[PDB]
Structure formats: structure tokens, C-alpha cells
Amino acid sequence: QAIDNLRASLETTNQAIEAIRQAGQEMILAVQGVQDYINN
Amino acid sequence: QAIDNLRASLETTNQAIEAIRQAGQEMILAVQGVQDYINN
């Protein structure tokens, strides 16, 4: 069960990382949006 | 002990992720600060 517990923790951690990765893609679009507006 | 070693590693990894997550919150404030200044 201790092995299963670690596996469930690491699954959860990977989901957290994926949420940060998607936040990063939104921040690239935000910086792109600022750069677009000052170059309009 | 190998199970305990993995657990300590994953604890450490989670702390690293939390540092990146907080860096992300500071980058949102930075992009907000740029957007605020060009809209002043």
C-alpha cells in the first residue's frame, strides 16, 4: 500500500505541474497581447 | 528505506513546484504592472 500511496501522490503532483504548464501557456498569450497592443 | 527515500524526494519535488508556482504569481503581477503603466 505504501508503494500505491507514492504512486497516487506522484499522479497528483503531475496534475499540479500540468496546471502550472497551462498557466505558462496563458502567460505567453498575455505577454503576446501586451506586445501586440504596443506594436498596433 | 527505499520507500522513505522516494517519499523524501517527492516532498522535495513538491517544494520545487511550489517555488515555481509562486514565481508564476509574481510574473502575473509583473505583466499586470506593464499593462497598468501603458494604460495610465
Binding site: 500511496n5 507514492l6 497516487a8 501522490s9 506522484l10 497528483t12 503532483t13 496534475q15 499540479a16 505541474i17 496546471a19 502550472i20 497551462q22 498557466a23 505558462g24 496563458e26 502567460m27 498569450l29 498575455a30 497581447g33 501586451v34 497592443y37 | 517519499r7 517527492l10 516532498e11 513538491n14 513546484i17 511550489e18 508556482r21 508564476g24 504569481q25 502575473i28 505583466v31 499586470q32 499593462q35
Partner: peptide
């Protein structure tokens, strides 16, 4: 730009929730 930063903030909050869940599983 504000919509993109809102969506980013939402995803960072979901990441925090998931990290606390990971930590709680490890405690067990």
C-alpha cells in the same frame, strides 16, 4: 490580456490545491 492573466491565476490556484492533496497523500 486580462482574460489570459485570469486564466493563468485560476490554473495556479488549481496547482496549489493539487500540491496540498499530494502532500496529504504522502503524510499517509
Amino acid at each position: 490580456v486580462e482574460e489570459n492573466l485570469k486564466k493563468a491565476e485560476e490554473k495556479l490556484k488549481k496547482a496549489e490545491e493539487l500540491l496540498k492533496k499530494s502532500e496529504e497523500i504522502l503524510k499517509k
